[PDB]
Design a binder for this molecule. Structure first.
Ligand code: S8T
Ligand code: S8T
Lengths: 306, 306
């Protein structure tokens, strides 16, 4: 028993992290097979970031201007290209530690692990969610760009995020591994504001199920609700609307606990209307929304990775 | 910017995890050089755990009764011994992935990362603290025993915890890697109750510093206090007494922020007396106490590991 905000084991990704330096600028890259993926703004100075013309800045760069270092060993760059907002640096050596992997573009509400790195070296691992406004709430200092987010299914790493930007409000924006930003964000130092940070309703419900499983049940009540009635409260509290698809996804947790999804919605509705009255749920005094239903099932079942 | 509950990169420890089976019972072991460390209750059945005589149960076990598997490859056991509450299984092959390591016995209030494993396979990583009552609040299902807790300084893994028991109240107990339990707990299925779960005051103060650094400052007030006056409030709220040693440890965070330690104590005192009035600090609605001062400095500075 016990329920913790739990990241995937990070070793498979650690083996892929390298340093990339272009002129004055150093950040992180991801070495898979014979390609190193990194943010294209490695080519920019701080000045350039106000108004960069990436294609023009790139003209002045040759393969030998991209210094790529894997631990203590230098990699030879034999080609480079820009794809959307990432550079692909072809090197002459396949990474011997390349895991089975996929590139995935995740949907808002999905969770993933981040391996925060500096100078190609891992500093720590933590769990994030893609927020409904397409930001993430991470921990990224200068030099962390190129750190990645990922999920693992058994033996296969699904990379879903690369870090590129901190907004002035302190939240974080980045791309998939094809270099397309999540949301409307651009790799420019401008006024980019995030929209409403709505709460991921299906994840809160999953977490309430996790609570019940792991002993915390004070919030269960005598009531039920309907999808439309619940969503009238969701809107008021800036929660995502709950859909039939969400109910279906919660089916397995409903079956394990015997608590109908709509009954748990009535519990959540009461918590939103009345607060927690100074009580806690799984050690938190607010409603946690960065566990997916699949996260709850996995952690409560002990699924492992090859 | 951003501040997250952040675990150490887990790869160095992943490479040390093995499966240990004795008769009917399977749990995890830690393979360093040519020794596998695991909980001695691998030799017990569920029945045995009510009242085990470990020395008597061990007499019936030979080297070939301890099945040790590292991924798909079986290790040959050439000797075994019991040290306190762990078994040391000597195998004929040194782990080629052995990192630089130390065994450390930590003090209450110190934090560490846990690599939760099942059947020798990693499932996830998260950050814990040794509570003042010598429990930890983990996420451990049946089969997780032998999972370890650790810290990393650059290239060297300091192992500090091995998981052995879940108390009836759902919190967790275990040993250092010499097999000595933290606190009064024993590897028996009995009535073992945990004492008061007091809050780690110096860690809360460190976390308030982290908040100020990362933008959250609404709780700063016009007041100061003294150690003795603050501790009169600490006692009331089941917080550890703050000592001069603690103040000294917070010195560097005091210097970076310009907020005197005793001024931050006055902020904390107001938060304890008045609550948070429905506000949040670094995304939490309660006072977080599982970040040490060194954790805050590390995460806010971007320290990395070899
Ligand atoms: C990473 C990216 C970054 C790039 C540059 C150069 C001008 C290209 C300067 C500064 C940064 S700072 C940064 C800050 C964060 F909070 C997260 C990621 C980065
Ligand atoms: C791990 C240890 C464990 C051992 C046995 C045998 C009888 C030796 C049975 C059950 C367990 S269950 C367990 C449960 C937890 F929550 C955490 C660790 C273990």
């Amino acid at each position: 028993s016990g329920f913790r905000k739990m990241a995937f084991p990070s070793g498979k990704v650690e083996g892929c992290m390298v340093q990339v330096t272009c002129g004055t600028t150093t950040l992180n890259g991801l070495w898979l097979d014979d390609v190193v993926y990194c943010p294209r703004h490695v080519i920019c100075t701080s000045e350039d970031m106000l108004n960069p013309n990436y294609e023009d800045l790139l003209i002045r760069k040759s393969n030998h201007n991209f210094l790529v270092q894997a631990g203590n060993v230098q990699l030879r760059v034999i080609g480079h290209s820009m794809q959307n907002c990432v550079l692909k640096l072809k090197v002459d050596t396949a990474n011997p530690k390349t895991p089975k992997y996929k590139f995935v573009r995740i949907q808002p509400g999905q969770t993933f692990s981040v391996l925060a790195c500096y100078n190609g070296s891992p500093s720590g691992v933590y769990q994030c969610a893609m927020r409904p406004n397409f930001t993430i709430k991470g921990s990224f200092l200068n030099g962390s760009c190129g750190s990645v987010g990922f999920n693992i299914d058994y033996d296969c790493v699904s990379f879903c995020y690369m870090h590129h930007m901190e907004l002035p409000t302190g939240v974080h924006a980045g791309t998939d591994l094809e270099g397309n930003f999540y949301g409307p964000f651009v790799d420019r130092q401008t006024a980019q504001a995030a929209g409403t940070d709505t709460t991921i309703t299906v994840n809160v419900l999953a977490w309430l199920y996790a609570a019940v499983i792991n002993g915390d049940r004070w919030f269960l009540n005598r009531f039920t609700t309907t999808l439309n009635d619940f969503n009238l409260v969701a809107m008021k509290y800036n929660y995502e609307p709950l859909t039939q698809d969400h109910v279906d996804i919660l089916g397995p947790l409903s079956a394990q606990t015997g608590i109908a999804v709509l009954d748990m919605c009535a519990s959540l509705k009461e918590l939103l209307q009345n607060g927690m009255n100074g009580r806690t749920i799984l050690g938190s005094a607010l409603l946690e929304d960065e566990f997916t239903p699949f996260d709850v099932v996995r952690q409560c079942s002990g699924v492992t990775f090859q």
